[PDB]
Design a protein around this ligand. Structure first.
Ligand code: CLA
Ligand code: CLA
Ligand code: CLA
Ligand code: CLA
Ligand code: CLA
Ligand code: CLA
Ligand code: CLA
Ligand SMILES: CCCCCCCCCCCCCCCC(=O)OC[C@H](COP(=O)(O)OC[C@@H](O)CO)OC(=O)CCCCCCCCCCCCCCC
Ligand SMILES: CC1=C(/C=C/C(C)=C/C=C/C(C)=C/C=C/C=C(C)/C=C/C=C(C)/C=C/C2=C(C)CCCC2(C)C)C(C)(C)CCC1
Ligand SMILES: CC1=C(/C=C/C(C)=C/C=C/C(C)=C/C=C/C=C(C)/C=C/C=C(C)/C=C/C2=C(C)CCCC2(C)C)C(C)(C)CCC1
Ligand SMILES: CC1=C(C/C=C(\C)CCC[C@H](C)CCC[C@H](C)CCCC(C)C)C(=O)c2ccccc2C1=O
Ligand code: SF4
Ligand code: SF4
Lengths: 741, 132, 73, 161, 60, 80, 137
């Protein structure tokens, strides 16, 4: 039995003595503060476990228990959300009439006149309209009562307590040994077969037994009062057979193999439910059941204790070709001996997955009455896009950290990492060329269109009525997806999404989802997206590859991961560390995602979202002005920013006034960040010297000498405030533009 | 011949090495082991004498510091011009600069505190700054 | 661009650009006479400030002239 | 009077603003049943608005052509209520704070662990000091005339002074 | 002047100019800056001591 | 090339010489210090101006000082 | 196997012998281009390069110029190509007079001058030939 449980009992004593010795973790900070810089360092190195102990076992035990703490925090957050839904929300009124009632689960105390923020959402209720789509999620779960929300919150609180206790227990009482952590095969088997496999299976069971019948009754018009409790759907089979007359057969078809008998509630119709405007619940049930089967199957791939299984070490060592020397030899050691490598991969994947979620959820609204809630759709899309970008850049940063710290050339001789480091110059040069090519061509299309439109030469622009750049490949793919039902997906009644083509799904006179046509403006904006993504990849990849050494600093690794510079020599050596590459990559990621969000918002407002008449006529929010106005920079400035910013600037005196205040505050913080971004530390140090003289002249002099922020901290603060200001500005802009509806 | 076993990388020297000064570093390795190149990923040092070429003195000295602080190996550094001239650089008299060596002569030494330098106005319109 | 991002990143990028130019057929014939290096720190701050000022003045001049001449006020 | 300002008691624009606020609140409450919690909240808001406007009318503030109160801060005693009185309070409160802080700095400063006593406050001593701030002006003046307020020229400086 | 005696600094370029520091050691073996002094405050480099000549110290 | 100057306040601890990446500095015998050694900059043509020597200086103010001047290929940190 | 080995068998040079960099295909293709072919007078190299780049350049101006939709589009494109060729020959002359200052290999004052004269003649020839071809098509 190679895979076995190993723990140390009473690893760490539990006491408050350390709580009164801040900075105990690090050897340098444990000596007490001489200057204010110490303070900052104590908050910067708090979670840098690798720099606090030289033993991997101790770092692993800290990471495990910190993850337990994060789970406790997340469970507390879920408990709070559910409790505010049960006690402070109009969930029942929204249930009764989802179309008219505006979701809201937050109430403001009237203390300074802020009660104006209590909007007239409806349902004899006043509160702040929420855009987290929690009401749609709860309806998809067939909640239909506030007692269930209350008990959901209580369970979440108990789970948060359990997570906290588990963290404490697994640090101070039973801390697993290092050999326990270094089980990639067993961990993958357990996370795939159970965490993701049985999780899907259990959720599919819930949907089949709870969500499906309740939502079917709700769609039929049954008032939530008359819907029997979910447990009533588990005791009397006939009560469910009325809705899906396949339970009558029971589980015998499942074991007999006649799964076709379950097609009543396990369908593959796809498309969207015309009533609620969301995905069919039966489709999601079949989806989760299939995913559960696949995950359970995939969880048996790796060898843990019985001979059968895959050894990932051999798997990696086996893949090597003529062009790559030793192939994937040494990657298993890297990913089982350094948390930074694993964190880089996991953060990159989580970020990309979050962006994929954002793209898929809007195209195929998964919850009932979420499609027509334009405010929820936009908020969810932008939120998950931002999360994905942040996670991607974090993965880059931790890859760089691994390269600086946990990279060992002795164990990486002529493998993939060695070869990549050995043709990094070619990689970066070509990425630079492609970035310049993309930027030039894509952005110069916009500049050319703007110049021609300013000169009155409209026939010379890159527009539909002018030189045309049709995204022919995307249109061809859309056509194929349109034709898929019946030909390449014969058992699928309807296309996966109505974006590609088909009817106009509208719920309550609102266009839930309709086909999206791609024109020259779509071509140009997509190439802008590609340009920005390529530039961000350039910055971050350059930071990762040149993290250890460069033709400027052959010994950069000795300087550490984040350092300000290496002096004004060799010309200038500012921002030469990989941390500074992350610092710039964050700006470029923010820029790219801002463009992505603007594209999504304008395209959806001008081409998808709108209203329908009984005849079938379509009237979009902005009247389809995207095709002929999204092709010039002035068009974006006028028809998108200036035109759609009316709601924020005019929100004063209404329930949305908070959005205008936050708009101004975000502008203020964004401008404030420039103070740190542009200026340097010496000026501020001298100014502080003068101020310290002034204090001393009155015998006021802190023992902790004041110090200007370190160069690295100056950059970090500037970047943090820049991102906060930009994100908040767009947050207020979108929410006020999409809540005045 | 004597070069450490290296698979080659795009970080080596360039045209200026042929047209301008190139640098060489020699050392002795008791055993065969892997060290990080200042330019590429990794290389294997031969048992006995190892000779390596670089484009900057800083790269040679960084590699020398790596050898000294990791594999406790003594090293020598030379500069080769296109004309064929070779100059001995890093150990100037067989002993490292950190260790005192009788015979060396001070250079760029001022016999007064740093704060006693003349004002810029005193040295004006002459091709000199206060330090000179 | 010049006020936020500082020299080291750009010098390390120009290193790769130099390598790429030197390793291209049909372009090795054409070689720079002055070695291409990133802008100096003070020069970079000056150029960033100059761009900032030029853009500031041009945009505000355009606004003040155009609004007044378009609404005659 | 002052700069062509008519007292808000006889300001038609002031009354128009009051009426506009009340009528918009009434229009907002017309969409709720009488006695509903939203209706009660809106009625309380209406009452608070009426009380605010009545207090402003009775206070003696000066209105402008826009109907909003304007503050006179030239030292006029009849308008001290606007700026002079609160200002004094501020200068008292902050004064207190400042004085107390200084004292703490000069109390824990005569120790080897003076730095360690700034991240970690000696709460008993801290409250002892904090309770003494109500006489900050007297103590400050006594220190000033006693020479214990300011440090001598013999203190840190720079090369050109 | 003597071990443990407080001295006011007179070095104009010094971070502790016009400040009081305690003498740690004095070198009687010639030397241009023999008097080692230690100050309470740490300079920007984190050090809190320096060598001074007796001419650059006011005695007390 | 940059100009590197060592003042008599130096205490001959060698830290500046150790920190130097281009082997510009060295130790020479001296009598004005307890250690009997002082730093010197015989070959400043190889100085790049990183000012690591100044950063690695115990003396109150930088017994070793670096003044940037004319730039050459060596002092400009250029492999080309 | 191992298709990536150090260039020129020198591990310490900033290059690699990849299939793109050092393969019979690329060596033979580049070794027969006028810029690198053996036994060519610099005048002939310039003439070949100019012929290649003149015929090549009329098309973009002709088809995407402001007068593309007029019945004189081809002539405007030809004139634009001629002007650009003149600019490039000015560039070549100044580059030669700046680079090689103190018939042979192309890297000399006289060699580069002959190359530039050949390039101008060949570029005007290519532009004229492209015009002739497109005039009736
Ligand atoms: C986790 C997410 C979350 C969030 C963001 C909120 C946010 C909010 N809740 Mg909700 N709530 C949550 C979870 C959450 N709650 C949970 C889990 C429960 C179940 C118990 C509730 C139950 C609940 C009720 C019953 C009510 C709210 C209310 C409120 C609002 C006012 C809170 C406030 O300032 O009161 C005042 C809070 C304070 C003044 C905080 C106390 C200050 C402490 C003492 C500071 C101590 C800091 C300490 C020094 C730090 C060191 C640690 C030390 C202990 C050693 C606000 C919108 C109220 C509301 O909306 O009214 C209409 C309301 O009535 N919440
Ligand atoms: C973890 C998920 C989960 C859970 C806890 C349950 C639990 C249950 N199911 Mg459900 N079911 C599930 C997933 C799940 N099912 C899935 C994925 C499908 C699709 C194939 C079904 C399809 C299904 C049908 C068609 C029926 C049930 C029934 C039942 C009940 C009787 C169980 C029985 O006799 O089996 C014996 C136990 C084992 C074999 C073990 C029980 C409450 C029956 C019911 O509602 O009667 C009360 C019934 O008729 N289930
Ligand atoms: C076969 C049953 C089944 C059914 C009915 C659904 C139904 C649905 N899926 Mg799911 N899905 C399934 C299986 C299924 N899925 C599997 C097996 C995968 C793994 C790739 C996925 C991955 C997936 C993603 C990533 C997303 C969906 C989404 C959706 C919804 C989009 C609307 C639609 O018409 O979907 C039609 C669905 C399809 C056309 C996908 C079919 C995928 C096929 C079956 C792949 C089969 C792979 C094959 C088994 C590989 C085996 C290799 C192994 C042997 C080694 C819908 C509820 C979207 C959603 O809910 O967003 C809100 C979404 O973003 N599905
Ligand atoms: C799984 C997620 C994850 C984990 C576990 C870590 C863990 C770590 N990171 Mg990584 N990182 C992540 C995600 C993650 N990071 C992401 C997404 C990014 C991209 C931005 C980065 C970028 C990054 C860099 C660039 C660096 C690290 C570093 C570190 C280490 C020290 C962190 C520390 O001391 O925190 C200290 C935490 C703080 C000081 C809190 C600051 C939080 C921000 C600035 C403010 C948040 C504002 C809030 C959301 C909204 C405010 C509202 C306003 C109105 C008040 C530690 C190993 C550092 C290191 O050296 O590690 C070796 C380092 O240099 N990380
Ligand atoms: C809006 C201002 C702006 C602009 C135009 C640029 C432009 C550029 N940045 Mg910069 N950047 C900016 C703001 C800006 N940035 C800011 C605020 C930051 C702070 C975070 C950065 C940080 C930053 C980094 C860290 C990086 C860049 C990179 C790039 C380049 C991307 C490649 C490209 O598009 O080349 C094409 C050039 C353009 C699209 C510019 C417009 C040119 C138009 C189309 C034509 C102009 C007319 C023509 C020249 C007429 C000539 C004649 C005339 C002279 C008379 C490009 C030089 C990357 C880079 O250089 O590597 C590729 C890179 O790594 N930037
Ligand atoms: C009790 C501490 C204390 C005292 C007595 C003073 C006194 C003074 N300060 Mg200083 N200051 C302090 C703390 C203090 N400051 C702190 C903590 C900061 C950092 C934010 C500053 C930053 C600062 C600047 C940048 C400047 C002054 C200036 C001044 C002078 C004018 C008043 C002023 O502008 O206040 C300004 C006060 C602030 C900007 C922040 C004050 C924050 C709190 C309220 C003070 C700390 C209270 C603390 C909790 C004490 C607790 C005691 C308790 C433990 C018993 C005056 C000599 C100015 C000057 O030089 O005038 C000639 C000037 O330019 N101060
Ligand atoms: C400020 C001075 C200036 C002037 C007078 C012009 C004039 C012109 N430009 Mg503009 N241009 C300028 C600056 C200027 N440009 C700058 C700074 C830029 C960069 C932003 C551009 C970018 C630009 C573009 C992108 C285009 C033009 C085009 C044109 C031509 C318009 C089409 C037409 O009717 O001609 C018809 C043109 C011809 C019949 C061809 C004749 C070409 C020249 C005049 C022949 C003689 C050249 C001569 C031998 C060169 C001497 C070299 C050296 C001694 C200087 C016209 C000749 C258009 C053009 O040329 O169409 C193809 C066009 O597409 N220009
Ligand atoms: C997914 C990426 C698709 C494009 C991959 C290109 C072929 C990539 C490919 O076939 O690589 C295959 C090639 C062969 O390696 P081996 O088969 O010897 O390696 C065995 C592996 O198991 C690793 O050990 O690897 C390289 O040469 C890497 C450096 C590639 C140099 C060419 C890079 C060109 C990049 C730009 C191309 C962009 C095209 C459009 C992208 C959408
Ligand atoms: C939301 C949430 C919550 C809750 C939740 C819940 C309540 C859940 C549940 C869940 C569940 C309740 C689950 C279940 C599951 C189950 C499963 C997963 C099962 C499985 C089974 C199997 C797998 C079987 C198998 C078999 C059989 C059939 C027998 C024969 C043989 C064999 C073995 C093959 C709370 C409030 C706390 C908080 C927040 C979060
Ligand atoms: C295949 C292909 C490719 C490429 C291509 C190319 C690159 C092309 C080019 C082309 C070209 C580049 C062409 C050119 C041509 C030219 C010509 C054809 C010329 C002619 C000339 C002439 C004819 C002249 C004449 C003359 C002179 C000399 C002077 C004056 C007089 C005369 C008129 C007699 C690839 C593979 C990538 C991909 C796919 C496609
Ligand atoms: C303003 C500024 C300073 C001076 C800024 C300082 C010393 C920060 C002062 C922070 C105060 C004392 C804390 C209180 C701040 C707010 C009232 C609230 C707290 C905010 C967070 C710390 C939680 C630098 O030191 C600096 C250094 C390098 C580049 C740019 C700059 C720079 O721009
Ligand atoms: S300006 Fe700042 S970051 Fe740049 S070299 Fe000087 S100290 Fe380093
Ligand atoms: S670091 Fe400073 S004190 Fe030490 S030897 Fe060098 S110059 Fe002298």
């Amino acid at each position: 039995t190679k895979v076995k449980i190993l723990v140390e009992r009473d690893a760490t004593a539990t006491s408050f003595e350390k709580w009164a010795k801040p900075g105990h973790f690090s050897r340098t900070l444990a000596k007490g503060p001489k200057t204010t810089t110490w303070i900052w360092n104590l908050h910067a190195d708090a979670h840098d476990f690798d720099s606090q102990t030289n033993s991997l076992e101790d770092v692993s035990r800290k990471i495990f228990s910190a993850h337990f703490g994060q789970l406790a925090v997340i469970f507390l957050w879920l408990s709070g959300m559910h409790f505010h839904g049960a006690y402070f929300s109009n969930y029942l009124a929204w249930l009764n009439n989802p179309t008219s009632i505006k979701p809201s689960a937050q109430v403001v105390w009237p203390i300074v006149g802020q009660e104006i923020l209590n909007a007239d959402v409806g349902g004899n209720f006043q509160g702040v309209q929420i855009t987290s789509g929690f009401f749609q999620l709860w309806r998809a779960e067939g909640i239909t009562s506030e007692i269930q929300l209350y008990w959901t919150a209580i369970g979440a609180l108990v789970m948060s307590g359990l997570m906290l206790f588990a963290g404490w227990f697994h640090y101070h009482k039973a801390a697993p040994k290092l050999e326990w952590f270094q089980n990639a095969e067993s961990m993958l088997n357990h996370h795939l077969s159970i965490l993701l496999g049985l999780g899907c299976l259990s959720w599919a069971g819930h949907q089949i037994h709870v969500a499906l019948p309740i939502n079917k009754l709700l769609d039929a018009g049954v008032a939530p009062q008359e819907i029997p409790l979910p447990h009533e759907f588990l005791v009397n089979r006939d009560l469910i057979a009325q809705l899906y007359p396949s339970f009558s057969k029971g589980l015998v078809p499942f074991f007999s193999g006649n799964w076709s008998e379950y097609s009543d509630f396990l369908t593959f119709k796809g498309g969207v439910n015309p009533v609620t405007g969301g995905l069919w619940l039966t489709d999601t049930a079949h989806h989760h059941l299939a995913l559960a089967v696949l995950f359970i199957f995939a969880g048996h791939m790796y060898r843990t204790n019985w001979g059968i299984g895959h050894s990932m070490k051999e798997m990696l060592e086996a893949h090597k070709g003529p062009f790559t020397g030793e192939g994937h030899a040494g990657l298993y050691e890297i990913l089982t001996t350094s948390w930074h490598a694993q964190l880089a991969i996991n953060l990159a994947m989580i970020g990309s997955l979050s962006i994929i979620v954002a793209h898929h959820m809007y195209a195929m609204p998964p919850y009932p009455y979420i499609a027509t809630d334009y405010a929820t759709q936009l908020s969810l899309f932008t939120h998950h896009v931002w999360i994905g970008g942040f996670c991607i850049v974090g993965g880059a940063a931790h890859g760089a950290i691994f390269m600086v710290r946990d990279y060992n050339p002795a164990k990486n001789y002529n493998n993939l990492l060695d070869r990549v480091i050995r043709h990094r110059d070619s990689i970066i040069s070509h990425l630079n060329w492609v970035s310049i090519f993309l930027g030039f061509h894509s952005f110069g299309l916009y500049i050319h269109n703007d110049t021609m439109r300013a000169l009155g030469r409209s026939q010379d622009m890159f527009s539909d009525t002018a030189i045309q750049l049709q995204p022919i490949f995307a249109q061809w793919i859309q056509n194929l997806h349109l034709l898929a039902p019946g030909n390449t997906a014969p058992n699928a009644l309807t296309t996966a999404s109505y974006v590609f083509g088909g009817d106009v799904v509208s719920v309550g006179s609102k266009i839930a989802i309709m086909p999206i046509k791609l024109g020259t403006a779509d071509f140009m904006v997509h190439h802008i997206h590609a340009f920005t993504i390529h530039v961000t990849a350039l910055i971050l990849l350059k930071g990762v590859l040149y993290a250890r050494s460069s033709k400027l600093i052959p010994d950069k690794a000795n300087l550490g991961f984040r350092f300000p510079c290496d002096g004004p020599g060799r010309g200038g050596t500012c921002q030469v560390s990989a941390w500074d590459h992350v610092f710039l990559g964050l700006f470029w990621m923010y820029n790219s995602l801002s463009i992505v969000l603007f594209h999504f918002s304008w395209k959806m407002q001008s081409d998808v979202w709108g209203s329908v008449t009984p005849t079938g006529a379509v009237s979009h929010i902005t009247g389809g002005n995207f095709a002929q106005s999204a092709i010039t920079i002035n068009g974006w400035l006028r028809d998108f920013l200036w035109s759609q910013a009316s709601q924020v600037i005019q929100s004063y005196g209404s329930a949305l006034s908070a959005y205008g205040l936050i708009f101004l505050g975000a502008h203020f913080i964004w401008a404030f960040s420039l103070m740190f971004l542009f200026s340097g530390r010496g000026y501020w140090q001298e100014l502080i010297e003068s101020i310290v003289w002034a204090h001393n002249k009155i015998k006021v002099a802190p023992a902790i000498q004041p110090r200007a922020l370190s160069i690295t901290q100056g950059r970090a603060v500037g970047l943090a405030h820049y991102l906060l200001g930009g994100i908040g500005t767009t947050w207020a802009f979108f929410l006020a533009r999409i809540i005045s509806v | 011949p004597y070069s450490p076993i290296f698979g080659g990388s795009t970080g080596g020297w360039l045209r200026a090495a042929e047209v301008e000064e190139k640098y060489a570093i020699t050392w002795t390795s008791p055993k065969e082991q892997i060290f990080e190149m200042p330019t590429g990923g990794a290389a294997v040092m031969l048992i006995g004498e190892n000779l390596l070429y670089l484009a900057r003195k800083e790269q040679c000295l960084a590699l020398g510091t790596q050898l000294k602080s990791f594999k406790i190996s003594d090293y020598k550094i030379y500069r080769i011009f296109p004309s064929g001239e070779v100059q001995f650089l890093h150990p100037k008299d067989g002993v490292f600069p950190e260790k005192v060596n009788p015979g060396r002569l001070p250079v760029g030494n001022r016999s007064f505190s740093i704060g006693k330098n003349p004002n810029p106005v005193s040295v004006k319109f002459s091709g000199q700054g206060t330090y000179e | 661009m010049f006020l936020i991002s500082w020299r080291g990143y750009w010098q390390e990028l120009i290193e790769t650009l130099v390598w790429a130019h030197e390793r291209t057929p049909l372009a090795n014939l054409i070689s720079w006479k002055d070695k291409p290096v990133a802008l100096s720190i003070v020069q970079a701050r000056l150029v960033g400030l100059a761009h900032f000022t030029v853009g500031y003045i041009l945009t505000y001049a355009a606004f003040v002239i155009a609004s007044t001449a378009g609404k005659f006020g | 009077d002052v700069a062509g300002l008519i007292p808000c008691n006889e300001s038609p624009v002031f009354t128009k603003r009051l009426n506009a606020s009340v009528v918009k609140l009434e229009n907002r409450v017309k969409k709720y049943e009488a006695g509903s919690p939203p209706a009660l909240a809106l009625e309380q808001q209406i009452e608070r608005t009426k009380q605010r406007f009545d207090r402003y009318s009775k206070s003696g503030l000066l209105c402008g052509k826009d109907g909003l109160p304007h503050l006179i801060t030239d030292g006029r005693w009849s308008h001290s209520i606007e700026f002079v009185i609160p200002g004094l309070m501020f200068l008292y409160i902050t004064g207190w704070i400042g004085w107390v802080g200084r004292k703490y700095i000069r109390t824990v400063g005569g120790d080897t662990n003076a730095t360690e006593k700034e991240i970690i406050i000696d709460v008993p001593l801290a409250l002892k000091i904090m309770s003494t701030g109500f006489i900050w002006p007297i103590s400050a003046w006594q220190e000033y005339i006693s020479g214990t307020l300011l440090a001598d020229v013999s203190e840190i400086t720079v090369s050109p002074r | 002047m003597d071990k443990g005696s407080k001295v006011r600094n007179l070095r104009k370029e010094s971070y502790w100019f016009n400040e009081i520091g305690t003498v740690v050691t004095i070198d009687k073996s010639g030397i241009k800056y023999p008097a080692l002094v230690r100050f309470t405050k740490v300079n920007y480099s984190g050090t809190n001591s320096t060598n001074f000549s007796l001419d650059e110290l006011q005695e007390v | 090339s940059h100009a590197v100057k060592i003042y008599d306040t130096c205490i001959g601890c060698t830290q500046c010489v150790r920190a130097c990446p281009t082997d510009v500095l060295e130790m020479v015998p001296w009598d004005g210090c307890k250690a009997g050694q002082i730093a010197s900059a015989p070959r400043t043509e190889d100085c790049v101006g990183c000012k690591r020597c100044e950063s690695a200086c115990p003396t109150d103010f930088l017994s070793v000082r670096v003044y940037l001047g004319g730039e050459t290929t060596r002092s400009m940190g250029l492999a080309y | 196997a191992n298709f990536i080995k150090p260039y020129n068998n020198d591990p310490f040079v900033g290059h690699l012998s990849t299939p793109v960099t050092t393969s019979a295909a690329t060596k033979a293709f580049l070794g027969n281009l006028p810029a690198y072919r053996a036994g060519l007078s610099p005048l002939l190299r310039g003439l070949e390069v100019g012929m290649a780049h003149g015929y090549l350049l009329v098309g973009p101006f002709d088809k995407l110029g402001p007068l593309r939709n007029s019945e004189i589009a081809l002539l405007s494109g030809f004139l634009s190509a001629v002007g650009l060729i003149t600019i490039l020959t000015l560039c070549l002359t100044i580059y030669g007079k700046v680079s090689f200052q103190e018939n042979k290999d192309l890297l000399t004052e006289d060699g580069w001058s002959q190359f530039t004269s050949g390039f101008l003649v060949g570029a005007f020839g290519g532009a004229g030939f492209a015009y002739l071809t497109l005039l009736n098509l």
